[PDB]
Amino acid sequence: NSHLDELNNSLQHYLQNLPCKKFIPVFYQLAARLMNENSKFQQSLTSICYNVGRNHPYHSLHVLFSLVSNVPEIENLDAGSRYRAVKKILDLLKVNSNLVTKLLCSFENYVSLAEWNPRSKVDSTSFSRFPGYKWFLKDAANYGLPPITMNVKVNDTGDYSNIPTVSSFDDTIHFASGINAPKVITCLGSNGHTYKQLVKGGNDDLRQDAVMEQVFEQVNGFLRSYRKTSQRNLSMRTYKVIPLALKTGVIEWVQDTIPLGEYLDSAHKVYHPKEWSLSTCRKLIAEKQMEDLETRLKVYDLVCRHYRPVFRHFFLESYADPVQWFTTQTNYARSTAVASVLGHVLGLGDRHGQNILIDKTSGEVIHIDLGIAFEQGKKLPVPECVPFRLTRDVVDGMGITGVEGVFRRCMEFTLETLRREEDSLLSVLEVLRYDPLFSWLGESEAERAILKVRQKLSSTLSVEASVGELIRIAQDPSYLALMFCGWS
């Protein structure tokens, strides 16, 4: 309700006293809400934006620039008005001054770096590159600022000088290029720790990734304020996202990790050289595309018989002696179970190994590039069947036990905890609905999507039965065959 000022009066007399700390979790949507028109609701929103942008530059300025970075003029949209309002808020926060313009310059430099990309491949110790990189080698020497990808702790007072600022940046760019443009940039730290920033020039839905990460953080909070969902220490792991632009955002290249897809391709060859390669599988299934159901299942059964599971060997011979190995294995099981249940609930899209990062010394999984959400895939030009990522290799990696045990228990505890805090969740998804930022691939698929969310959390079926049916529907070969090429 944003029509009558009388309602807004009795709430603007209160929120002005509210600390800025409370306004950060929803500040993506709230930032999407401002506009340049003059209204009492607009006045309150401008005051909230100024309060958060002045008291806590760090947790708000990146969103502020994200909504001011690229905004065309001729085409008419609420994005343009929100851009004008957010630019006014930025000017107001800059009048009061050094840190605001320092963060603005940092964002401009990061986006310019993400714009360009050469062609190469490098790893191991030592490397040198980058044209016009003087700004990145003397960051704090010119503007004492933190690199944009640490979880800076929120302080009640708001102003702190104890945050670490890093100037020395390594000359190495172990850039590996997937679709479109990816550049990796590692900088040092004031405490003495290096942070790796993965900048992407490709039009990955990094804003959708950011709002999804906010939902994930609130879900971590829900799992935190409970007995069963925190004795396990279960948590859907979040990697910080700082999208300066949707097409050219920058994210936190998590501490040393090997993505699942880039992994187990070398492990498949080393562990099982005799069995068939991914080339035979891929386009053989390629021949399967135009065939009938029985042919598809038959060829998939043949290829799955050829390529035995191999990811079960990562956790062996890599981490440590057995206690650390088992802690890592249970961490992976719990994190992948929570992430899978959440993705099924929110209809997360692509779930290939190229969008999965296994930690290493901890084992917690990190889903990456969650652009497709709210049941966006399945309905692809090429259809799918599985709700959440569950191959044969993944369930092999959960241990000798398949998905029956720690995985199912974690999934069912996640389901019951999500149901118990349903109301707050659907509140969060509603505020996602009413803003035009979340991708739901007037009336929208978002409404039916959250209705399906409620049905997935509906108490009509017992939670144990729901987890059993989910495991069956995501493990059965009949569903797995039609998914896509590979996915063994």
Binding site: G261, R282, D350, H352, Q354, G371, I372, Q376, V382, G486
Partner: peptide, 8 residues
């Protein structure tokens, strides 16, 4: 690379 392009 081989995963579906997820294009519109």
């Amino acid at each position: 690379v081989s995963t579906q392009e997820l294009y519109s």
